[PDB]
Amino acid sequence: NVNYYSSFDEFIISQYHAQDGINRVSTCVILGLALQAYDQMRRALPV
Amino acid sequence: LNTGAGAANITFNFGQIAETVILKGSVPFQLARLNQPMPAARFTYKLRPLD
Amino acid sequence: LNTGAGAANITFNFGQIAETVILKGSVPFQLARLNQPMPAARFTYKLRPLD
Amino acid sequence: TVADGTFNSMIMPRAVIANEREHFMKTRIDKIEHDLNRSAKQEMMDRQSLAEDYNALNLAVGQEIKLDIATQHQLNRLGSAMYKADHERETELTDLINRIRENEVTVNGILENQKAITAAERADLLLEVVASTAKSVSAAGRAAADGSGVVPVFGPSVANGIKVGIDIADSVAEAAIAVKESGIITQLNDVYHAFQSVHVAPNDVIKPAAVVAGTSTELIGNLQAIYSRLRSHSDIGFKKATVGDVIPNSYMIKPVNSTEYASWQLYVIHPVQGSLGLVVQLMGDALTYNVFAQYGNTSASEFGKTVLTGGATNTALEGTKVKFQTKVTAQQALALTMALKDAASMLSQGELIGYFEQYINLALEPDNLSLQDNMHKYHHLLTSQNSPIDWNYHDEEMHKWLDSRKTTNYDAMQKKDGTVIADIHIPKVFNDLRNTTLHCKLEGKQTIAGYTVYEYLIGPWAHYGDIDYSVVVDTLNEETKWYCEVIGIDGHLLIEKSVQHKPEKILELTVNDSGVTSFNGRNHDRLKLKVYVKDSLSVKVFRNWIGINAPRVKTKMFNDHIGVKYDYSHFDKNISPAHLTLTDLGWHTWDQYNAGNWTNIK
Amino acid sequence: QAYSSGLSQNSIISLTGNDRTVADGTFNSMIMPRAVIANEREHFMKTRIDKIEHDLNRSAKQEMMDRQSLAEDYNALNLAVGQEIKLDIATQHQLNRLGSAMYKADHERETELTDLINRIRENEVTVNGILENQKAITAAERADLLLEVVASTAKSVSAAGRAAADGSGVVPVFGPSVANGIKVGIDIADSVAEAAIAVKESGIITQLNDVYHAFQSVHVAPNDVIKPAAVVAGTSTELIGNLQAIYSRLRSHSDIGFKKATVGDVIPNSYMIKPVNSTEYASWQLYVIHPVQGSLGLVVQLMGDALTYNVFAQYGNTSASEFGKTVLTGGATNTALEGTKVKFQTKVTAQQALALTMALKDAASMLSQGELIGYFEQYINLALEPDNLSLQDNMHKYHHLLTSQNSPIDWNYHDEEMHKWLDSRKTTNYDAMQKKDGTVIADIHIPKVFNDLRNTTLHCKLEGKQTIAGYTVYEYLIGPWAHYGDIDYSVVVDTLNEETKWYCEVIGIDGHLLIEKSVQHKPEKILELTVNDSGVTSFNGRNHDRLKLKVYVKDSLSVKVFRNWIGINAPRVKTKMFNDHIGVKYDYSHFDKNISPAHLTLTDLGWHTWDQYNAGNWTNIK
Amino acid sequence: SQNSIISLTGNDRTVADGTFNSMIMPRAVIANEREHFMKTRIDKIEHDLNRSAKQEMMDRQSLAEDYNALNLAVGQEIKLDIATQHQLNRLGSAMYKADHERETELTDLINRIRENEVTVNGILENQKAITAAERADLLLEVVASTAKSVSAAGRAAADGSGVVPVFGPSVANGIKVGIDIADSVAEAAIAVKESGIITQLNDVYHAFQSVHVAPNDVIKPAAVVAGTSTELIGNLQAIYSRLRSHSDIGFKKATVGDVIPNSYMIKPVNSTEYASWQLYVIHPVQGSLGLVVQLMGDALTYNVFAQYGNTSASEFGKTVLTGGATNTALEGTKVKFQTKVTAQQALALTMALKDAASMLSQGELIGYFEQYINLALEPDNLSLQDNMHKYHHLLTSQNSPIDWNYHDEEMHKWLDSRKTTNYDAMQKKDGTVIADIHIPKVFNDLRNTTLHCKLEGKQTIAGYTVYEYLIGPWAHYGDIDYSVVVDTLNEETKWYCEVIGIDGHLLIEKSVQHKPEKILELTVNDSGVTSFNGRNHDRLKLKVYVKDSLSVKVFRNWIGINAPRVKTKMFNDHIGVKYDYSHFDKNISPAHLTLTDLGWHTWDQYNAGNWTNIKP
Amino acid sequence: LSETELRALKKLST
Amino acid sequence: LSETELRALKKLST
Amino acid sequence: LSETELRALKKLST
């Protein structure tokens, strides 16, 4: 029961336009910074 | 002993000096104060004569 | 062994000296004291002979 | 798959008796069901026709049933409805017994190899290998399959609009007596307001019968033994209204101001169709019961001597009293009470209260499978030869007690008012249900070449003597010819009458102390009668005992049923009256007929 | 400022406890009251059962078949021009179906009350002993004892017992069932021909269809009324006077309810407003009750643990709002709350609904929010009294106050105002439709003959369950009268036999009148009476407030009695109160007497007084 | 919050008992045995009130005479003396009456919309934020509809007799099930064998319950996305075309000789444990597709399966739509129930509940689902209700994920093949005479069979009672004959029949009372359109005017057996061709009639009103 | 039996 | 139709 | 009245 998006650009814009969008984008921003750390860590330590 | 057609009401006055009176009957009986609902039949009652 | 038409009553007297008596039957059976209601059938009875 | 707990509260059994709206809702649909099938307007209409047919039976003096009297009409309305519903259930049991006998090999395999599964699953399997008309053992399915006749009798609707207070003072005029006969005493009015009949379907009985059965013969014997006890209790229920006493009402005692953690419940069941009562107490998680006799009661106490004990019950508890009418027999209620006692530790307090109240008020079996199995096992034990309760002793003592009450009440009223007034208010003719001269209106849904078939089952008889059967046929067309067929083991007897609107005697039978009759040189426990009528509107069958208060045959038990076996497979076959010839009427054994054509002799 | 009554109230202990929330899986949770209007499953199940009862007793197929016979009987009454009841018109037939069913239920309830009075008066010594000895027990317990010492046919005061004791003829009229399959909106355009008018007469307008879809009658059993009547009764005469005072108010409301359909206006619908998304511990409920059989309405609001109510008049609205003037205030009620609206039909009167509201307001602190919701909705929707014994008695004490002479509401003033307002509405609607359409069209859709239940010429079918020597006894109670003038009574008898000899008996305080007619399938006039402004009639030299008519038929199939007033819109009689009933006492004990038509001679017919007879044998004179 | 659907219980998933939120929570009618028992009793009572078994037995002789008097050709005669045909006629006649009444109410609703199309177009265009239920109230108020409530309580109050679902167990009560002949080809033996049905037909009836959808249900899906009045009317006709085709299939399953499956629920044997799972298997008798719904925890999965082309080993056919993995081999207690909603209606709620699976408690998911299937009770959650109606429209519209026409056609071919196989099997075992008794080849489809529809009249014009019968729409093409039977107390009477078309009506006067009289013979093409006096028509209205009537019956008969089918119309087909039904309302007064008035007369001849006298 | 049916049936017999 | 009604109706016809 | 009863009654009347 989740949706799938081609890019993080689409994901954050879709949540912004949904009901209760202003408080949804706050969570998505933290997800983006978490994903930024995930990319750098996994490239240095590929498993 | 009741020799009449229907049930009868007997008034008991125990004075005002006695502190506690305990009533026990050979068979369960109904007892209540003035202007109070009559309970189910019980063997024993504990009463305050001042009531 | 009962050969009569209807169920029979057998009276058991265990005295008054023994403390406890345990009764076990080959089949479930009914036991009760004198002039007392009978219970449902069961295998084992623990009784006081003075009862 | 762990739940949040909301679902389990929705399937939680509910306190139907204690909750008022649930008790209000059930009274309403039981009233609606009774009025759907038995209409007061219709019954008042057929009073005149029924009175004429009863007078036309030419009964001896002192045995006449006078429907012009209000008391006798009211007791006839209760008796005819009660006897009808019992008659369909006996007919259904006979049909089920036949199907089991055709598939004995398959039934035996199920009984031997299905000991592990639940009682309900075994019953469903048994009803599938046989071509049973009803194949559902669930309560919802049984309601759908139930017919019009088997609907329980609602007493308060029967005694509605009947005049009660008629006062003639020191008047012996014929006009005054006519007015007096039009009314009923107040005592009979209270009897009807506390009357509700219980009729148990054969599909409900198959679960107790098959729970420990190992052979097809044992399964049939268990079914017959239960219905021997069930039919006996229905007779006692009707006799209770016949005497001049007032029947007690079942009630439940609850605390006036109940507490969350210290609530208690006390249930007192007074089955009108039975000789024993039940008192069940629920204090906390402890369950206690007592089985008491409904006979020999003094004026001071409403409970007789207790015959089975399961603990200590306090009937002097103080609280609010709520009246209700049971939908299960004393044996059925006792079976659950024993089962609930064993599972008290593993069941919540709400489950204990909900399961018990649903069974007594709605005849609903518990959803728990383990609880269901134990109840049906206990039901078998209470109806077997090794039952803890000697039902025959208590049924006979209730019969003796009820007869003494009728004499005491009749003599008391005779002194106060007189013989004429006593006979109006306490009729001596009615006596027991199977003793009473009663009629059973028949429904026909089968038409063979334009002739509607009406089926009646003669017997089984709980009484011995001489019995006469009469049939009344009403048709739209004038100058019709109708046929009567009486089927036995050896053959059938065919009769042509061609008389309408009047009773016509078709059979006279003699029953011995064992409840068996000699029909053309063979012993028959029951016979099947089929009436064929063209363009019929109403067919009524009357039964009549030559003497009043016929003596009772001892109730048969399991050993008596397996000792003698009678074949009822021939009750299904019928004839085509349109193709009948003159030589075909009379008594003719099967050997004469060709296979499959029982209308024309070789 | 909320109205404060100094009425003494018993203490109430809730099932929930000190914390005001019931514990899970307890016996108290299983006996808790729960909402019936708010829950869809219950509000659907109860409507289905209500519809089933209506179709059992009143079948549309039968009532459609009896239209031809009923039309002939009304025609044969030979009414004056402008007073004729033409059942060929669809609107008149529809209104007669509502009128006949409502009157039959009111007549049966009045009959039972008359018998209950007779039993009480016979056992006066025992009844007087109960009333003065037992003044501390609850009202329900007093009713059970009173119904036992008297040989009442219905001795049960429980809701389940009352339902079983009730028979066909007192079942409430289900409005939607009546208006099923009737053609609506027949359109003839600028045609005055006979064929066009015939088609026009066969249909009804949309307004009448809407009126019937919002109609449900309420008829209170005598056993319900005995509890309020005995709360403060000290003597038997006071108890009887209280019983008659309550039923006088009840009957007056029934006439108003029928008058609402006769006028061209649509009747309002009672509804409940609930939050769109209910939140735990922040829920609220608003109940708006427009009783059809009444002159006043009720608005009840449950916000938090606070109960607020308002009583509003149903007359004088300017169509800008659905609420009239406020007559009694019990706080501030906000009817502008936003939420889902659920429509329901009330099964209790305004006086009964208000009694529980006042009792619940005094118990708001001692009862949880859910208990207040459950007890209110159960009584409004199912007429089910609360299981809480203390709360039930408090409701009955308030019910007595609202009916007594010292009631905070002047019921006579409001009932009279509603009659005047309803008369004005009929004139306005008739005049408006007389302009837009023709006079002929106006008469079809707004008949002038139908005014109110006890004014319009109506028939009442009689049911017979008593047979005396082959003759079935059919009983009809003449009176009491809420209108004064001249009233004619006719009897229609249908019998399978070609020639029949049927008798009519009219019983009064001193003697009875016996008549023979021997005419079938045609109305026969039996009695003509003149009723004075006080509602009493002079029958054979004595004042009578009511009489008893018994019809004896052999092999009967249907017996109907027609009631007819000489002039339409007969003037009303002021509703009797407790003082009026106490002042004048009439003996009804002679209504139980019967005669045997078979043992009747020619000299016994006519008017004979009781002294001419022996004890018993009321058929034959000495 | 983010979720539009808000559960009555909060995120804590706990609701205190005795509070308002708990009082309005849905109930599990199927899972609770007290609730299931109560629903069955009320349903049986409703059926027995309207349809009386004692009345149907008495009317058997009268109906048998009428069917023979139709003078049908050999091989097409309906013989009600045979028990199997009588039982099939009882089920079919009640089935067709309910469908006929629903179609009649639809035509009135269409006329009302077209009269106020300007106001209706404004409501549909301007107001789109309100829910489907609120939109229906406004439309049903703007048009002067007789029934103005979409609530389940108001619907049941105004449903009326004749639309009550048929109860199979009541119909099958008291019929002989087992008769043996034992190689006896005799007139007496054959007569006896004709009096009893077989076990297969008894089992079919015990698992039968018809579903009839009121127009007030159809209006909510129709107006959920409609923008114009034409779209609203086109959606209404498209839904009812699908419903009528499914209703035809439901009757055909009884005619063919096999036992229909029964819907059931599987729940764990142990009650009140941690593990909670439920499986629902819905076998709609009035349809071609089934539904399997599984709820494990808060996860909901569904599978739509074909009810045709299935081997004896597995009850389920091929899966035509998937919504997850559903295990039908789960072990537990099996509770049988009768669905009261169509397959599309059940599927619509399943999709909506899946979307809000995590936003509602398990008790809410189960209660809302079971109330809809077992009571046709729409969920009280307005947000959940709106989503369900949106899915109902999608399942019906041209963009439906399910090709309904393909599955309905396959069901028809599969049922015909089964009848041939069962007839051949019994022919070899017993014989032709016995096979014809048990599997009649004359019945076939519901709208193909010769059937009678008893008429009820509540309108009387100058002493003449009006009985209304709607001719069409037709799902088959061929030649059709219509007959009328009039039973009247009077020894001699004159009754009139009127057939309303788009331009004019036909007036007929007849005198024969008890024998059927042919009124109208028609020819219908492959598009389900007939040419009635030079104008193409899709349906006609027949009104019978009888004085002092007791009963009026209309008999429908096709010239050839097993009439070929007409493809089911869809939304595009309905908007293409528009027919006017505003003329079905006008009446005539037989009392004020002359000899010149009888016959076929166009409207131009009459005045405004006065459709009786032809003078303009 | 309805009153309409009874009156109609009475007329036919007479 | 009831039995009494049918019996009464047959008497009128004869 | 059923159709069977009405037809039978009419035949009896004539």
Side-chain angles (χ1 to χ4, degrees), chain F residues 379-394:
Chain F
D380 184 1
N381 194 283
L382 298 214
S383 318
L384 201 69
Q385 215 197 103
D386 207 57
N387 306 333
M388 161 175 98
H389 292 315
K390 285 184 249 248
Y391 281 119
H392 195 188
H393 184 235
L394 178 84

mmCIF file of all heavy atoms in Angstrom, chain F residues 379-394:
data_model
loop_
_atom_site.group_PDB
_atom_site.id
_atom_site.type_symbol
_atom_site.label_atom_id
_atom_site.label_comp_id
_atom_site.label_asym_id
_atom_site.label_seq_id
_atom_site.Cartn_x
_atom_site.Cartn_y
_atom_site.Cartn_z
ATOM 1 N N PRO F 379 -22.118 1.662 4.261
ATOM 2 C CA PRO F 379 -21.343 2.097 5.428
ATOM 3 C C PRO F 379 -21.731 3.497 5.882
ATOM 4 O O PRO F 379 -22.052 4.369 5.073
ATOM 5 C CB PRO F 379 -19.892 2.050 4.931
ATOM 6 C CG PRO F 379 -19.979 1.950 3.445
ATOM 7 C CD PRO F 379 -21.252 1.242 3.150
ATOM 8 N N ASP F 380 -21.699 3.700 7.201
ATOM 9 C CA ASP F 380 -22.011 5.005 7.770
ATOM 10 C C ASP F 380 -20.877 6.003 7.577
ATOM 11 O O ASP F 380 -21.121 7.214 7.579
ATOM 12 C CB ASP F 380 -22.340 4.869 9.256
ATOM 13 C CG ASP F 380 -22.767 6.181 9.879
ATOM 14 O OD1 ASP F 380 -22.825 7.194 9.150
ATOM 15 O OD2 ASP F 380 -23.043 6.203 11.098
ATOM 16 N N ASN F 381 -19.641 5.525 7.436
ATOM 17 C CA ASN F 381 -18.521 6.403 7.125
ATOM 18 C C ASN F 381 -18.739 7.029 5.754
ATOM 19 O O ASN F 381 -18.677 6.337 4.733
ATOM 20 C CB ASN F 381 -17.202 5.629 7.168
ATOM 21 C CG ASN F 381 -15.991 6.538 7.186
ATOM 22 O OD1 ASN F 381 -15.604 7.097 6.161
ATOM 23 N ND2 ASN F 381 -15.379 6.685 8.353
ATOM 24 N N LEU F 382 -19.001 8.338 5.725
ATOM 25 C CA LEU F 382 -19.355 8.997 4.472
ATOM 26 C C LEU F 382 -18.202 8.966 3.477
ATOM 27 O O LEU F 382 -18.417 8.776 2.274
ATOM 28 C CB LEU F 382 -19.795 10.437 4.741
ATOM 29 C CG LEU F 382 -21.028 10.700 5.612
ATOM 30 C CD1 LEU F 382 -21.757 11.934 5.120
ATOM 31 C CD2 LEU F 382 -21.974 9.517 5.603
ATOM 32 N N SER F 383 -16.972 9.159 3.956
ATOM 33 C CA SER F 383 -15.819 9.119 3.063
ATOM 34 C C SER F 383 -15.658 7.740 2.435
ATOM 35 O O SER F 383 -15.353 7.625 1.243
ATOM 36 C CB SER F 383 -14.554 9.516 3.820
ATOM 37 O OG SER F 383 -14.792 10.625 4.668
ATOM 38 N N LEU F 384 -15.859 6.684 3.223
ATOM 39 C CA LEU F 384 -15.806 5.331 2.680
ATOM 40 C C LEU F 384 -16.949 5.083 1.704
ATOM 41 O O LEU F 384 -16.771 4.389 0.696
ATOM 42 C CB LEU F 384 -15.840 4.314 3.818
ATOM 43 C CG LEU F 384 -15.307 2.915 3.517
ATOM 44 C CD1 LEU F 384 -13.804 2.943 3.318
ATOM 45 C CD2 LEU F 384 -15.683 1.961 4.634
ATOM 46 N N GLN F 385 -18.129 5.633 1.992
ATOM 47 C CA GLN F 385 -19.275 5.448 1.108
ATOM 48 C C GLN F 385 -19.040 6.096 -0.250
ATOM 49 O O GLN F 385 -19.401 5.529 -1.288
ATOM 50 C CB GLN F 385 -20.533 6.017 1.761
ATOM 51 C CG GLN F 385 -21.799 5.243 1.463
ATOM 52 C CD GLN F 385 -23.048 6.040 1.773
ATOM 53 O OE1 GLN F 385 -23.709 6.554 0.872
ATOM 54 N NE2 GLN F 385 -23.376 6.153 3.053
ATOM 55 N N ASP F 386 -18.442 7.289 -0.263
ATOM 56 C CA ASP F 386 -18.218 7.994 -1.521
ATOM 57 C C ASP F 386 -17.243 7.242 -2.417
ATOM 58 O O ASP F 386 -17.442 7.165 -3.634
ATOM 59 C CB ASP F 386 -17.708 9.407 -1.247
ATOM 60 C CG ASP F 386 -18.058 10.376 -2.357
ATOM 61 O OD1 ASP F 386 -19.259 10.517 -2.668
ATOM 62 O OD2 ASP F 386 -17.132 10.996 -2.920
ATOM 63 N N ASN F 387 -16.177 6.687 -1.835
ATOM 64 C CA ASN F 387 -15.209 5.939 -2.630
ATOM 65 C C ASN F 387 -15.836 4.685 -3.222
ATOM 66 O O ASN F 387 -15.516 4.296 -4.352
ATOM 67 C CB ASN F 387 -13.994 5.581 -1.778
ATOM 68 C CG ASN F 387 -13.378 6.788 -1.108
ATOM 69 O OD1 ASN F 387 -13.482 7.907 -1.607
ATOM 70 N ND2 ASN F 387 -12.730 6.567 0.027
ATOM 71 N N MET F 388 -16.725 4.033 -2.470
ATOM 72 C CA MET F 388 -17.375 2.826 -2.968
ATOM 73 C C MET F 388 -18.231 3.123 -4.192
ATOM 74 O O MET F 388 -18.232 2.354 -5.160
ATOM 75 C CB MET F 388 -18.219 2.196 -1.861
ATOM 76 C CG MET F 388 -19.270 1.227 -2.355
ATOM 77 S SD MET F 388 -20.144 0.413 -1.013
ATOM 78 C CE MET F 388 -21.611 1.427 -0.920
ATOM 79 N N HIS F 389 -18.961 4.239 -4.171
ATOM 80 C CA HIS F 389 -19.803 4.597 -5.307
ATOM 81 C C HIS F 389 -18.975 4.970 -6.527
ATOM 82 O O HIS F 389 -19.397 4.716 -7.660
ATOM 83 C CB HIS F 389 -20.737 5.739 -4.921
ATOM 84 C CG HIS F 389 -21.780 5.348 -3.922
ATOM 85 N ND1 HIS F 389 -22.502 4.178 -4.020
ATOM 86 C CD2 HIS F 389 -22.216 5.965 -2.799
ATOM 87 C CE1 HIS F 389 -23.342 4.096 -3.006
ATOM 88 N NE2 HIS F 389 -23.187 5.167 -2.249
ATOM 89 N N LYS F 390 -17.806 5.578 -6.321
ATOM 90 C CA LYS F 390 -16.918 5.869 -7.441
ATOM 91 C C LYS F 390 -16.425 4.589 -8.097
ATOM 92 O O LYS F 390 -16.309 4.516 -9.325
ATOM 93 C CB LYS F 390 -15.740 6.721 -6.974
ATOM 94 C CG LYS F 390 -16.089 8.174 -6.726
ATOM 95 C CD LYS F 390 -14.858 8.983 -6.363
ATOM 96 C CE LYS F 390 -14.893 9.419 -4.910
ATOM 97 N NZ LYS F 390 -15.060 10.892 -4.785
ATOM 98 N N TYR F 391 -16.125 3.567 -7.295
ATOM 99 C CA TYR F 391 -15.701 2.292 -7.859
ATOM 100 C C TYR F 391 -16.860 1.556 -8.515
ATOM 101 O O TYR F 391 -16.650 0.812 -9.479
ATOM 102 C CB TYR F 391 -15.061 1.425 -6.775
ATOM 103 C CG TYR F 391 -13.631 1.798 -6.465
ATOM 104 C CD1 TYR F 391 -13.265 2.226 -5.198
ATOM 105 C CD2 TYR F 391 -12.650 1.733 -7.441
ATOM 106 C CE1 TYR F 391 -11.962 2.573 -4.910
ATOM 107 C CE2 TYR F 391 -11.344 2.077 -7.162
ATOM 108 C CZ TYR F 391 -11.006 2.497 -5.896
ATOM 109 O OH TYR F 391 -9.704 2.840 -5.613
ATOM 110 N N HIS F 392 -18.080 1.740 -8.008
ATOM 111 C CA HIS F 392 -19.240 1.107 -8.630
ATOM 112 C C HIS F 392 -19.473 1.645 -10.034
ATOM 113 O O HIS F 392 -19.800 0.884 -10.951
ATOM 114 C CB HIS F 392 -20.480 1.307 -7.760
ATOM 115 C CG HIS F 392 -21.622 0.407 -8.121
ATOM 116 N ND1 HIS F 392 -22.875 0.537 -7.562
ATOM 117 C CD2 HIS F 392 -21.701 -0.631 -8.984
ATOM 118 C CE1 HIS F 392 -23.676 -0.384 -8.067
ATOM 119 N NE2 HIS F 392 -22.988 -1.106 -8.932
ATOM 120 N N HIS F 393 -19.315 2.957 -10.221
ATOM 121 C CA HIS F 393 -19.441 3.529 -11.556
ATOM 122 C C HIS F 393 -18.352 3.012 -12.484
ATOM 123 O O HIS F 393 -18.619 2.695 -13.650
ATOM 124 C CB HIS F 393 -19.391 5.052 -11.492
ATOM 125 C CG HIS F 393 -19.615 5.710 -12.814
ATOM 126 N ND1 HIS F 393 -18.728 6.614 -13.357
ATOM 127 C CD2 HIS F 393 -20.627 5.594 -13.706
ATOM 128 C CE1 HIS F 393 -19.182 7.023 -14.528
ATOM 129 N NE2 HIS F 393 -20.334 6.422 -14.761
ATOM 130 N N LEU F 394 -17.116 2.931 -11.991
ATOM 131 C CA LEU F 394 -16.013 2.479 -12.829
ATOM 132 C C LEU F 394 -16.212 1.036 -13.271
ATOM 133 O O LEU F 394 -15.925 0.688 -14.421
ATOM 134 C CB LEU F 394 -14.691 2.637 -12.080
ATOM 135 C CG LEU F 394 -13.437 2.154 -12.806
ATOM 136 C CD1 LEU F 394 -12.918 3.228 -13.745
ATOM 137 C CD2 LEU F 394 -12.370 1.746 -11.809
#
